[PDB]
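Work Package 3 committed the consortium to producing structural models of liganded targets before the mid-term review. Because experimental data for this complex are still outstanding, the team generated a predictive model from sequence and the ligand definition alone, so that downstream docking and mutagenesis planning could proceed in parallel. The input record is reproduced below exactly as it was submitted to the modelling pipeline, together with the SMILES string for flavin-adenine dinucleotide.
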Amino acid sequence: THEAFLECLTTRIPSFTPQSIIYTPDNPSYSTILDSTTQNPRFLSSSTRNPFAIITPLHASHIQAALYCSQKHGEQMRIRSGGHDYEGLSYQSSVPFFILDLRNLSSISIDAKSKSAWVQAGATIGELYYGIAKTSLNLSFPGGVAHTIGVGGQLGGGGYGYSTRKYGLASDNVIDAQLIDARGRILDRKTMGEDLFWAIRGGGAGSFGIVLAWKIRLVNTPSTVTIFEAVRSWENNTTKKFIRRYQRRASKTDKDLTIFVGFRTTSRISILTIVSATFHGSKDRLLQLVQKEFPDLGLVSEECTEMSWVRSIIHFNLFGDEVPLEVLLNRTLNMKAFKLRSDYVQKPIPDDVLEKLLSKLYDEETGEGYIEFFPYGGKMSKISESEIPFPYRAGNLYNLRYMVSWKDDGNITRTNMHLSWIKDAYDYMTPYVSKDPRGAYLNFRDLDIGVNVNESDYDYVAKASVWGTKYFRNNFYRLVDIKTIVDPTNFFKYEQSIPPLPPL
Ligand SMILES: *Cc1cc2c(cc1C)nc1c(=O)[nH]c(=O)nc-1n2C[C@H](O)[C@H](O)[C@H](O)COP(=O)(O)OP(=O)(O)OC[C@H]1O[C@@H](n2cnc3c(N)ncnc32)[C@H](O)[C@@H]1O
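The resulting structure, written out as tokens with the ligand in place, is given here.
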């Protein structure tokens, strides 16, 4: 159906042919556009991954047209930049929808003098890092690691990486933005006002408008960085001491050092402790620091490598060792299905509890389960809980992520056994993670913490506060009042959209 919507589009798009940016299931390149940024393969066989149209705007005016026609005739929009949402909310809906796909809005301009950049929402962080590196090796931006993450989604939900302890989240370093609200107005920080500019910086911008471009602060980094890659046996009692110390110290060591820890089973079947890190400093200083503060890791100089910050990004994207061209960061032409959940840890997990936790990896097939620690101290502890809607600051030792990966047979029953393994691991940890409410991280989206009910239900707001206070805490109620002002008719809505107050 949707005749009135589709006809209104070709009419309102300034013509140089609108049918070029409008893909429908008949068009042979519709399947390729849909698949290319379906980033979690578990949704490849999803029956709700069936937009009736995909629109690829080339200018702001195409977004305004798609917006105007969409509210006029009641059809539903899913915004997609990089497509990396872990629940695939940018390309799935239970009701008929179209995708507004921002891939062709990916222009980047950099001002080295004032250490700032403009990035359009369809750019990946790989393209941004490439542009920054071609300008200076003393400039960084703390986005994530994986080079195909879209800046559209990432900067609207937080953005954690190897340099967050030094610089804060990607959202903490946004200084302006171009946002298109429900009325089709193109606003920036001055005209959108401070409440809305607060809300889009980690509150989930897609609840409030279509971010056209972000303006970011570029940060100063030393020209060379040191990484280490290290593997230890979890059965080694000295590494168990290291993990004991890590829980208490990784969030409190030098802000220039961020250490990630992961666990998976290998090979007759044992658990590996995976340890990786970036240090904004020299190798000699890295070895002195880690040996004084984490001696049970037994870090050896052969585990450490000095390189430029952008090269450290390229290495952690699994290129290199025999290094490829820097233009690697531009190749978005990038495979197992996965489910993940996460938790905030504020008190060290007791040793016996961590053992039982990790023992659950044996119950999944070898190497499929994965448990990771991402430390939160440093700058994250110097920023208030309401500076932006992201509230997990001081008092958080690390974010604990659970993940299970698999190859999809088509068999629902066997796919459900993996979902059931994660749920089991998450339920077991209930008494040892944050409580009231159990915290979760927006950019590690998880529908199992709760979803919206129907917007006409009388308890739509309170139901939304179930997941809403897990992502945001007391910042949720301020997001609701802001949503009421900028989107009173609730055009921007999905399974975990901030609700506006019911109209009086
Ligand atoms: C797939 C993935 C994700 C990922 C990661 C590695 C991989 C392989 N590593 C991450 C990391 O190290 N640190 C981190 O904090 N997150 C990491 N992620 C997750 C990823 O960064 C987030 O999921 C992010 O939101 C993804 O953004 P992207 O833009 O790529 O994804 P999307 O599906 O298209 O959109 C995400 C949500 O935001 C809304 N959206 C998208 N664009 C806009 C604009 N322009 N305006 C408003 N809302 C927008 C989508 O509708 C969706 O809800």
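Reviewers should note the following from the model. The radius of gyration is 23 Å. These observations will guide the Year 2 experiments.
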